[PDB]
Ligand binder design. Structure first.
Ligand SMILES: [Cl-]
Ligand SMILES: [Cl-]
Ligand SMILES: [Cl-]
Ligand SMILES: [Cl-]
Ligand SMILES: [Cl-]
Ligand SMILES: [Cl-]
Ligand SMILES: [Cl-]
Ligand SMILES: [Cl-]
Ligand SMILES: [Fe+3]
Ligand SMILES: [Fe+3]
Ligand SMILES: [Fe+3]
Ligand SMILES: [Fe+3]
Ligand SMILES: [Fe+3]
Ligand SMILES: [Fe+3]
Ligand SMILES: [Fe+3]
Ligand SMILES: [Fe+3]
Ligand SMILES: [Fe+3]
Ligand code: NA
Ligand code: NA
Ligand code: NA
Ligand code: NA
Lengths: 178, 178, 178, 178
């Protein structure tokens, strides 16, 4: 039995380029987390309590995704390399602009997973594609959800009354088409 | 064993300037109470039932704070001196203006506590600073809450539709960021 | 009513040096979080599942502390400034060495709070000292706990048998003197 | 409607090389089963009751996997061909050596699935890749688990005291990092 780079027994070696791609993706998940924290704060500063609660939870969930990836590297006997984390964006001129950035963040998270996926396929790493499959499925749901929240906020067309109604929807947990 | 000014056994004497400051602060709490009663009436007169219910409860809570201070003076064997109470402000041109006065009242209540606190520290009265600590903590929460209600009302920008939505939030007990 | 730097109604202005100190402390909490994540991974890589579970939870708790501070700045109508986050330490020669770093991290977290506390006192910011008081109390408990875990691991004196026993204690939730 | 090789209605023909690969893989699952039975006996002979119970269950689970594959061939209207089964390895000089063989058996089971998977992809057999996906996911978990048990036994470094502690973990059902 061979030992993997992290010292554990090695079921199958991993291409170093794929390993690097996964380590970078963990940073993307962590960056999504702190981005959603910054968004939660921006909303709290404007008394948009439902949006604050929503993004506070999204921040925690993205962190959980990052940890989920660290556990996969452990399971593959690969080294983790937790990286320096950039500061998030923190300023927006409107809730619609914030929601556009949020949607882009979600879509960019999927693109990162897709890039890891393509590298795993090039390397015939079926463990990794199988690991990623349910994460892509979750991303479809999150993209659908963020398109819903962004589209609903855009429909409000900057009317504070409409934004208060939507804020109350989010506080109540009404965050998807359902 | 010595007797304190109110006749009870005296654990430790209190500086008369500090005593006067606490008696004055009790009046501030009582004045906040009747101010919130006046605000509850103003809201009721305009059918803002959720704001009426909110301020009706705040009036009762501020009175409870006043009584809490009277009990501390009893516990310190100090005399209470219930003072003449000014009439509250009773007229506002808008709910936003009323909420600004409410926020100021809350902040001024904290300033009064802070002034008592500084005098207690100058007099090395650790019982009093310890007594006040949780009241300051409660004030932070109340200031955060009143900034939320004021900011949400200002966001409404005088639109009756938005103010009805917020009124219904308060009736439902949705009075904080959460 | 004045507006604070984050746009909300301002109960009382905050010294910019104190604000900067709180923003820096939030980074310390976030850095403790990612440090404990790195420690959880190191333990998982060596099959120390109880230590992995312990530090996984500590990472989540430190993040919660960071968010708690961001909410205080919101409550004070002060701007948040989420900073770039350094990469954590990730390599240790032994569990005893890891636990020494963990204890130091906990003690350094308290020192950071103490530094903010002293600045608040210099500025007569009683809201901030009151906010910090229960966090210092929690730090005493965490320092006591980490001294217990470190001391118990050192008592094991590198014997794998003893470290397996302690690992099982942590998995069972036996993490303090009790 | 066409009839498949096993006589049932045929949804889509299967490449004979892929069929042979699946039939061979069923033998690999059956061989893993009897290997884990032999390991359970080796442990029972040395009073390692927790390891005996663990491998007794693994033997049953691997047999269930074999049957699961036989049901897939039935579902595809393909013939099953249950093969002669080699005798398992039965002798080891130490528990660490046994656990190394167990880890290798688990990794080799995954390699067999991976080989079937690659053949299905070459043949555009999407039913088979979909069938195998959750089995690969289960293999990741089993490899992580066996790396944990092997690594924990190696950490014991042949100390009977440590091996008794781990034996008791397994008897209690503590068989993974968790
Ligand atoms: Cl908007
Ligand atoms: Cl951006
Ligand atoms: Cl208004
Ligand atoms: Cl006034
Ligand atoms: Cl050690
Ligand atoms: Cl260090
Ligand atoms: Cl051994
Ligand atoms: Cl062998
Ligand atoms: Fe994510
Ligand atoms: Fe996401
Ligand atoms: Fe009060
Ligand atoms: Fe008050
Ligand atoms: Fe206290
Ligand atoms: Fe902390
Ligand atoms: Fe800590
Ligand atoms: Fe199997
Ligand atoms: Fe298996
Ligand atoms: Na409107
Ligand atoms: Na309207
Ligand atoms: Na021992
Ligand atoms: Na021993």
């Amino acid at each position: 039995v061979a030992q993997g780079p992290n010292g554990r027994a090695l079921a199958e070696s991993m291409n170093p380029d794929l390993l690097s791609a996964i380590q970078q993706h963990i940073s993307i998940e962590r960056y999504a987390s702190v981005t959603y924290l910054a968004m939660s704060i921006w909303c709290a500063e404007r008394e948009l309590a439902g949006f604050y609660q929503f993004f506070d939870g999204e921040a925690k969930d993205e962190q959980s995704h990052a940890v989920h990836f660290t556990q996969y590297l452990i399971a593959r006997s690969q080294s983790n390399d937790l990286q320096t984390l950039d500061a998030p964006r923190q300023n927006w001129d409107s809730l619609a602009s914030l929601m556009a950035t949020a949607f882009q963040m979600e879509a960019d998270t999927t693109s990162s997973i897709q890039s890891v996926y393509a590298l795993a396929e090039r390397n015939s790493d079926t463990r990794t594609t199988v690991f990623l499959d349910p994460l892509i499925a979750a991303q479809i749901q999150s993209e659908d959800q963020f398109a819903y929240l962004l589209g609903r906020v855009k429909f409000a067309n900057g009317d504070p009354t409409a934004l208060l109604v939507i804020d109350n929807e989010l506080r109540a947990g009404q965050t998807q088409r359902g």
